[PDB]
């Protein structure tokens, strides 16, 4: 009974939820309690049921939604823009037998692995409340897109909804995947560049390997690359 965890698209199949992996295989839950996850994208932990385009699975944990917001705005300081107030640890961590970095899920979706620092809380309610304070927004500044541009550059804007000193104290290591539907971004990129698709998407992050202080001399900028692929 092979086991697997990973990022999947969430399907609404006439009211029942199924999933689709990055290879395009539909994963059909056979759990006796219905899946009720309301997300566009998810992280699941599962096993393949015995008796082998669709595979029946048993979920081994409650599915987790991982949707995050991608926006376009013309430049820094305009409507919808977000100001970073915390550094990530990295946009990479260990998944399976290797490290994973920002990657392409489908023509419409990309995924950021985020390694970051949270407050040390212990009640289930508190942990859930703490996690909700962290928002990872990808921003495309459309004024920066010029005619012919083959590179789509996105800024990770990471905001913690807490006071500056409490942000600085966070030290508990956490990992999460964040999935971004980027069709609207791609549409705007096409209109400004005249290109049908970018050769690559770049993700620009403020990260700090040592502490959670944004204005620390250890905070660096790091650019992660995604080679953008299509069936066409
Ligand atoms: Cl569920
Ligand atoms: Cl509790
Ligand atoms: Cl570049």
UniProtKB/TrEMBL annotation:
Keyword tags: Lipoprotein
The organism's place on the tree of life at top rank: Bacteria
InterPro entries, sorted: NigD-like_N_sf (IPR038179)
Protein name (database record): Lipoprotein
């Amino acid at each position: 009974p092979q086991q697997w965890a990973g990022v999947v698209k969430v399907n609404d199949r006439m009211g029942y939820v199924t999933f689709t992996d990055a290879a395009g295989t539909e994963l059909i839950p056979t759990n006796t309690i219905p899946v009720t996850l309301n997300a566009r994208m998810a992280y699941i932990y599962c096993q393949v049921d015995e008796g082998q385009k669709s595979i029946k699975i048993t979920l081994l944990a409650d599915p987790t939604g991982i949707d995050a917001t991608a926006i376009t705005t013309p430049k820094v300081g305009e409507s919808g823009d977000v100001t970073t107030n915390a550094p990530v640890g990295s946009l990479s961590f260990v998944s399976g037998y290797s490290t994973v970095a920002p990657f392409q899920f489908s023509e419409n979706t990309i995924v950021l692995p985020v390694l970051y620092r949270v407050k040390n809380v212990t009640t289930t309610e508190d942990i859930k409340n703490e996690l909700a304070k962290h928002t990872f927004t990808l921003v495309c500044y459309t004024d920066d897109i010029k005619s012919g541009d083959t590179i789509l550059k996105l800024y990770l804007r990471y905001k913690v909804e807490d006071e500056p000193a409490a942000i600085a104290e966070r030290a508990t290591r956490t990992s999460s995947f964040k999935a971004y539907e980027i069709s609207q971004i791609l549409r705007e990129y096409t209109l400004k560049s005249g290109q049908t698709k970018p050769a690559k998407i770049t993700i620009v992050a403020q990260q700090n390997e040592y502490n959670n202080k944004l204005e620390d001399t250890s905070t660096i900028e790091k650019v992660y690359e995604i080679e953008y692929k299509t069936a066409e």
